[PDB]
Enzyme design. Structure first.
Site, PDB file in Angstrom:
ATOM      1  N   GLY A  77       0.775  -1.225   0.000  1.00 28.34           N
ATOM      2  CA  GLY A  77       0.000   0.000   0.000  1.00 28.34           C
ATOM      3  C   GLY A  77       0.810   1.280   0.000  1.00 28.34           C
ATOM      4  O   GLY A  77       0.269   2.354  -0.281  1.00 28.34           O
ATOM      5  N   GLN A 156      -7.000  -0.982   1.746  1.00 24.94           N
ATOM      6  CA  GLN A 156      -6.895  -0.358   3.053  1.00 24.94           C
ATOM      7  C   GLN A 156      -7.622   0.984   3.046  1.00 24.94           C
ATOM      8  O   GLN A 156      -8.035   1.498   2.004  1.00 24.94           O
ATOM      9  CB  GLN A 156      -5.430  -0.197   3.473  1.00 24.94           C
ATOM     10  CG  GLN A 156      -4.657   0.947   2.838  1.00 24.94           C
ATOM     11  CD  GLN A 156      -3.273   1.086   3.447  1.00 24.94           C
ATOM     12  OE1 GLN A 156      -2.261   0.889   2.777  1.00 24.94           O
ATOM     13  NE2 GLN A 156      -3.225   1.417   4.733  1.00 24.94           N
ATOM     14  N   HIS A 185       0.670   0.817   7.543  1.00 18.04           N
ATOM     15  CA  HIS A 185       0.369  -0.604   7.403  1.00 18.04           C
ATOM     16  C   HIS A 185      -0.244  -1.204   8.660  1.00 18.04           C
ATOM     17  O   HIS A 185      -0.758  -2.326   8.598  1.00 18.04           O
ATOM     18  CB  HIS A 185       1.621  -1.399   7.004  1.00 18.04           C
ATOM     19  CG  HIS A 185       2.845  -1.084   7.808  1.00 18.04           C
ATOM     20  ND1 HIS A 185       2.995  -1.461   9.124  1.00 18.04           N
ATOM     21  CD2 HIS A 185       3.993  -0.451   7.466  1.00 18.04           C
ATOM     22  CE1 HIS A 185       4.176  -1.061   9.564  1.00 18.04           C
ATOM     23  NE2 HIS A 185       4.801  -0.445   8.577  1.00 18.04           N
ATOM     24  N   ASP A 215       8.428  -5.516  -0.204  1.00 25.49           N
ATOM     25  CA  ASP A 215       9.791  -5.393  -0.706  1.00 25.49           C
ATOM     26  C   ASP A 215      10.719  -6.497  -0.217  1.00 25.49           C
ATOM     27  O   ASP A 215      11.860  -6.576  -0.687  1.00 25.49           O
ATOM     28  CB  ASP A 215      10.383  -4.036  -0.303  1.00 25.49           C
ATOM     29  CG  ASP A 215      10.388  -3.823   1.196  1.00 25.49           C
ATOM     30  OD1 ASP A 215       9.302  -3.582   1.764  1.00 25.49           O
ATOM     31  OD2 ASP A 215      11.474  -3.904   1.810  1.00 25.49           O
ATOM     32  N   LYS A 374      14.728  -0.665   1.042  1.00 30.19           N
ATOM     33  CA  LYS A 374      14.273   0.663   1.429  1.00 30.19           C
ATOM     34  C   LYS A 374      15.011   1.776   0.701  1.00 30.19           C
ATOM     35  O   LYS A 374      14.540   2.918   0.710  1.00 30.19           O
ATOM     36  CB  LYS A 374      14.441   0.859   2.942  1.00 30.19           C
ATOM     37  CG  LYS A 374      13.885  -0.276   3.795  1.00 30.19           C
ATOM     38  CD  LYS A 374      12.404  -0.524   3.544  1.00 30.19           C
ATOM     39  CE  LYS A 374      11.880  -1.640   4.441  1.00 30.19           C
ATOM     40  NZ  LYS A 374      10.510  -2.095   4.066  1.00 30.19           N
TER      41      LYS A 374
HETATM   42  O1  LIG Z   1       0.078   2.913   4.606  1.00 27.32           O
HETATM   43  C1  LIG Z   1       0.914   2.067   4.308  1.00 27.32           C
HETATM   44  C2  LIG Z   1       2.348   2.172   4.462  1.00 27.32           C
HETATM   45  C3  LIG Z   1       3.177   1.168   4.097  1.00 27.32           C
HETATM   46  N1  LIG Z   1       2.668  -0.008   3.548  1.00 27.32           N
HETATM   47  C4  LIG Z   1       3.554  -1.130   3.142  1.00 27.32           C
HETATM   48  O2  LIG Z   1       4.149  -1.650   4.313  1.00 27.32           O
HETATM   49  C5  LIG Z   1       5.432  -2.182   3.978  1.00 27.32           C
HETATM   50  C6  LIG Z   1       6.462  -1.548   4.924  1.00 27.32           C
HETATM   51  O3  LIG Z   1       6.441  -0.203   4.708  1.00 27.32           O
HETATM   52  P1  LIG Z   1       7.990   0.601   4.719  1.00 27.32           P
HETATM   53  O4  LIG Z   1       7.550   2.038   4.734  1.00 27.32           O
HETATM   54  O5  LIG Z   1       8.717   0.009   3.573  1.00 27.32           O
HETATM   55  O6  LIG Z   1       8.619   0.194   6.112  1.00 27.32           O
HETATM   56  P2  LIG Z   1       8.543   0.879   7.533  1.00 27.32           P
HETATM   57  O7  LIG Z   1       7.128   0.957   8.026  1.00 27.32           O
HETATM   58  O8  LIG Z   1       9.510   1.983   7.692  1.00 27.32           O
HETATM   59  O9  LIG Z   1       9.131  -0.349   8.646  1.00 27.32           O
HETATM   60  C7  LIG Z   1       8.575  -1.564   8.666  1.00 27.32           C
HETATM   61  O10 LIG Z   1       9.479  -2.562   8.232  1.00 27.32           O
HETATM   62  C8  LIG Z   1      10.726  -2.528   8.862  1.00 27.32           C
HETATM   63  C9  LIG Z   1      11.616  -3.654   8.279  1.00 27.32           C
HETATM   64  O11 LIG Z   1      11.884  -3.338   6.946  1.00 27.32           O
HETATM   65  C10 LIG Z   1      10.508  -2.819  10.389  1.00 27.32           C
HETATM   66  O12 LIG Z   1      11.757  -2.662  11.002  1.00 27.32           O
HETATM   67  C11 LIG Z   1       9.494  -1.766  10.936  1.00 27.32           C
HETATM   68  O13 LIG Z   1       9.253  -2.103  12.270  1.00 27.32           O
HETATM   69  C12 LIG Z   1       8.209  -1.886  10.120  1.00 27.32           C
HETATM   70  O14 LIG Z   1       7.283  -0.981  10.634  1.00 27.32           O
HETATM   71  C13 LIG Z   1       5.728  -1.773   2.508  1.00 27.32           C
HETATM   72  O15 LIG Z   1       5.425  -2.876   1.713  1.00 27.32           O
HETATM   73  C14 LIG Z   1       4.744  -0.622   2.271  1.00 27.32           C
HETATM   74  O16 LIG Z   1       4.305  -0.512   0.956  1.00 27.32           O
HETATM   75  C15 LIG Z   1       1.273  -0.192   3.370  1.00 27.32           C
HETATM   76  O17 LIG Z   1       0.779  -1.215   2.896  1.00 27.32           O
HETATM   77  N2  LIG Z   1       0.441   0.861   3.757  1.00 27.32           N
END
Ligand SMILES: O=c1ccn([C@@H]2O[C@H](COP(=O)(O)OP(=O)(O)O[C@H]3O[C@H](CO)[C@@H](O)[C@H](O)[C@H]3O)[C@@H](O)[C@H]2O)c(=O)[nH]1
Length: 482
Positions: A77, A156, A185, A215, A374
Site C-alpha cells: 500500500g 486499506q 500498514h 519489498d 528501502k
Molecule cells: O500505509 C501504508 C504504508 C506502508 N505499507 C507497506 O508496508 C510495507 C512496509 O512499509 P515501509 O515504509 O517500507 O517500512 P517501515 O514501516 O519503515 O518499517 C517496517 O518494516 C521494517 C523492516 O523493513 C521494520 O523494522 C518496521 O518495524 C516496520 O514498521 C511496505 O510494503 C509498504 O508498501 C502499506 O501497505 N500501507
C-alpha cells in the site's frame, strides 16, 4: 463528549461513506492527540530484550492441517517516495527483468504446486497502488487477476489529514484527494475487520495469517514457526533479526515489566511484555539510543504471524477496533508544496500489535528471511550476484556471503533517487558476492563486468565529470580515484 474538530472528522468520514470500524479507530486516535500525549516512547520507558528463541534451533514441523489453515498476505500500500518513486515499489525490476510482484506471484504458484494446493494469497493495496497492481496482474498472471477483486486484494482505508492549528480535517481545493491518506500498514487489522474479510477467513477455517513487507522477497511460510506457535500456544509472533549497521529505517524490539499478584497462595510473578519502537516514535533527543545496535539488537523484519480467531476476538471485545499506538506524522497537505496547509497524519505500524495480546512473543530468524529494499543501495545489492533465486522463487544471499549482506554505502546526493541510481549502473551491475563493503563518493559510473572484492571505496572529489570505471576492472581492498 467529542470535540468540535473530532465531530467534524466523523461527519467528513460518514459523508464519504468510510466504514465505521475505520471511523471508530480514527476517532480514538484523534481524541488522544487532542488530549496531549503523542505516544512517544522514551528510553526511560523501556528496557532491552535479552533472551529469545531462535528459528535455526527449531526442528519440529507442523502437520498439513495446520499448514492448510494458513493465509499469506503481502503489504503493497505504500509508495517508494524516498527512492524517487511515485508508484507501488513492487513494480521495480529486481532481477533478470522481473519485479517484486513477479516473484511474489511465482512464490504463490510454487506453494500451490508443491506444498499447499489451495494456498490463500492476499495483497493489501491502497488508493495509490491498486490500479497499477491490477493492470500488472491482468497481463502476466491471469489466474490471480481472475479472483483479484473477489479474493486477493485487501483495500486499506483512507483517513483525513487534520490541520495542526485546529485538528479539523484539512481543505485543499486544488486537489481534495490530498485531504486523505492511508494510515500506515498498521491499518491491516482495521481493514480486515471492517471489510468483513477477517470474519470470512475465520468462518472458512483459516487460523493463521503470515504477513510480510512487499519489498522483502525472502519471507515465506516456514512450517517450523507454525509448530512453534501451536506448541507454545502463541497468538502473535514477530520475527526479528540481529541488528546490523545497514538497518536504519524501521523499528526494534523492546520490553517493559508488569507485576501481577497472581492469585493468593502463589506469590507475585514478574512478567515481561514486548513492544515495538518505530523510528518515528522515538524522541529526537534519545535518537542516539535508538540507533545503538548493541543496546537494541533485535530488528523487526515485519514478518508477522497472527492467530486469526484470537485477533477477531480481541477486536470485537475492544469496541470493534485494535487500539494500536498512533504515530503523529507532520506534513503539508500537498508534499510538493511547502506552503500548503500544515497537517498531522495519524498512522500505526502493524508490528505494534505485539503489545495487544497476552501470549505474544518474538523469534530470532536468520538474514535469509529478511532482504529489505528501502533504498537504492539495497536495490544495488539485490540486483547483484550477491543475491540468488531459490527453487521456490525467494531472493536469498548467495551461500558464499555466509548470511552477511554486502554493506553498500552510496552517496545520497547522487544515488538516493532512482534516476541517479540507474546512471550508476548504466553499463552493468558489478559483482558484489565477494565484496564485504563498497562505498561510493561523488559522481561515479561502473563499467561492464566489474568485480569488487573485500573493502572497496570509489571516490571522485570534483563531481563535475563522472568517474567511469574501465570495463573489466577488478578492485580488491582499495580506494579508486581519478
Ligand atoms: O500505509 C501504508 C504504508 C506502508 N505499507 C507497506 O508496508 C510495507 C512496509 O512499509 P515501509 O515504509 O517500507 O517500512 P517501515 O514501516 O519503515 O518499517 C517496517 O518494516 C521494517 C523492516 O523493513 C521494520 O523494522 C518496521 O518495524 C516496520 O514498521 C511496505 O510494503 C509498504 O508498501 C502499506 O501497505 N500501507
Amino acid at each position: 463528549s467529542l470535540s468540535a474538530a473530532a465531530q467534524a472528522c466523523v461527519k467528513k468520514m460518514r459523508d464519504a461513506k468510510v466504514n465505521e470500524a475505520c471511523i471508530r479507530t480514527f476517532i480514538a486516535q484523534h481524541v488522544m492527540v487532542s488530549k496531549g500525549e503523542t505516544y512517544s516512547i522514551p528510553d526511560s520507558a523501556i528496557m532491552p530484550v535479552d533472551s529469545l528463541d531462535a528459528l535455526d534451533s527449531l526442528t519440529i514441523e507442523c502437520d498439513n492441517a495446520v499448514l492448510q489453515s494458513t493465509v499469506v498476505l503481502k503489504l503493497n500500500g505504500g509508495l517508494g517516495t524516498g527512492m524517487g518513486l511515485c508508484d507501488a515499489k513492487t513494480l521495480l525490476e529486481v532481477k533478470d527483468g522481473k519485479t517484486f510482484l513477479d516473484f511474489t506471484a511465482l512464490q504463490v504458484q510454487y506453494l500451490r504446486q508443491h506444498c499447499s494446493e489451495h494456498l490463500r494469497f492476499m495483497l493489501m493495496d491502497s488508493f495509490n497502488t491498486s490500479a497499477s497492481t491490477k493492470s500488472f496482474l491482468k497481463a502476466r498472471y491471469p489466474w490471480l487477476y481472475q479472483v483479484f477483486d473477489s479474493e486477493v486484494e485487501l483495500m486499506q482505508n483512507q483517513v483525513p489529514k487534520i490541520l495542526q492549528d485546529t485538528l479539523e480535517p484539512a481543505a485543499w481545493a486544488e486537489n481534495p484527494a490530498y485531504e486523505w491518506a492511508p494510515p500506515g500498514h498498521g491499518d491491516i487489522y482495521t481493514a480486515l475487520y471492517g471489510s468483513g474479510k477477517l470474519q470470512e477467513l475465520v468462518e472458512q477455517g483459516y487460523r493463521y495469517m503470515f504477513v510480510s513487507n512487499g519489498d522483502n522477497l525472502g519471507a515465506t511460510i516456514d512450517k517450523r514457526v507454525l509448530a512453534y506457535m501451536e506448541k507454545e500456544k502463541i497468538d502473535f509472533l514477530m520475527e526479528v533479526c540481529r541488528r546490523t549497521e545497514s538497518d536504519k529505517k524501521g523499528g526494534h524490539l523492546a520490553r517493559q515489566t508488569v507485576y501481577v499478584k497472581g492469585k493468593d497462595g502463589q506469590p507475585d510473578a514478574e512478567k515481561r511484555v514486548l513492544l515495538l519502537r518505530e523510528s518515528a516514535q522515538c524522541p529526537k533527543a534519545d535518537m542516539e539510543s535508538f540507533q545503538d545496535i548493541n543496546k537494541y539488537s533485535f530488528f523487526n523484519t515485519n514478518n508477522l504471524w497472527i492467530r486469526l480467531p484470537v485477533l477477531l476476538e480481541t477486536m470485537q471485545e475492544h469496541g470493534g477496533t485494535l487500539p494500536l499506538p498512533v504515530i503523529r506524522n507532520e506534513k503539508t497537505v500537498d508534499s510538493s508544496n511547502s506552503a500548503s496547509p500544515k497537517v498531522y497524519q495519524l498512522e500505526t505500524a502493524m508490528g505494534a500489535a505485539i503489545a495487544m495480546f497476552e501470549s505474544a512473543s518474538a523469534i530470532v530468524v536468520p538474514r535469509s528471511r529478511f532482504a529489505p529494499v528501502k533504498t537504492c543501495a539495497d536495490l544495488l545489492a539485490l540486483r547483484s550476484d550477491a543475491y540468488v533465486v531459490t527453487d521456490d522463487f525467494r531472493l536469498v544471499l548467495d551461500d558464499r556471503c555466509h548470511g552477511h549482506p554486502p554493506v553498500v554505502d552510496l552517496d545520497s546526493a547522487h544515488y538516493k533517487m532512482m534516476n541517479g541510481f540507474e546512471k550508476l549502473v548504466q553499463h552493468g551491475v558489478p559483482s558484489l558476492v565477494e565484496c564485504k563493503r563498497v562505498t561510493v563518493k561523488g559522481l561515479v559510473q561502473f563499467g561492464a563486468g566489474n568485480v569488487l572484492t573485500g573493502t572497496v571505496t570509489i571516490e571522485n572529489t570534483d563531481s563535475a565529470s563522472a568517474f567511469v570505471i574501465p570495463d573489466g576492472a577488478k578492485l580488491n581492498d582499495t580506494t579508486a580515484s581519478p
